[PDB]
């Protein structure tokens, strides 16, 4: 039951993050404006390519 809780809560959190979205005219892609450290951008893009 605990892991069911954490899965469901996180998934709610994912939907919350997805609420913040580029409402484009036609794009099926999304362009999000986010603040992020310049320190870790190498790990950022490593994660993205993963």
């Amino acid at each position: 039951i605990r892991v069911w809780f954490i899965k469901v809560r996180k998934m709610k959190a994912i939907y919350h993050t997805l609420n913040l979205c580029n409402i484009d005219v036609t794009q099926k892609c999304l362009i999000a404006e986010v603040w992020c450290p310049v320190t870790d951008l190498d790990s950022i893009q490593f994660a993205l390519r993963r």
């Binding site: 404006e33 603040w35 992020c36 310049v38 320190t39 994660a47």
Partner: protein, 97 residues
């Protein structure tokens, strides 16, 4: 030297929706991305994914009912650990149904 605020920058991440379904999860695993509402003038209910969010609220309600039922009956929870055990499928919908 001294301590100052760490350096930050803006970034436009271009991202298909299917790729987003995993990019959000990994940016949460990382825990180092601040977001912003790109179109804040739109109401929260006019974001047309509240059907899924309402479903999630129902899931929480059912799980809370289970929690109270077990607590009355004195049934413990294991609660070992393993926090990062996190997929992001659509089959979870049918599972919780």
């Amino acid at each position: 030297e001294l301590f100052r605020s760490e350096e930050m920058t803006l970034a436009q991440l271009f991202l298909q929706s299917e790729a987003a379904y995993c990019c959000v999860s990994e940016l949460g695993e990382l825990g180092k991305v601040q977001f912003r509402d790109l179109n804040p003038d739109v109401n929260v209910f006019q974001r047309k994914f509240v059907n899924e969010v309402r479903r999630c609220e129902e899931m929480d309600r059912k799980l809370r009912f289970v929690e109270k039922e077990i607590r009355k009956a004195n049934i413990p929870i294991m609660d070992t650990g393993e926090n990062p055990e996190v997929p992001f499928p659509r089959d979870m919908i049918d599972l919780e149904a």
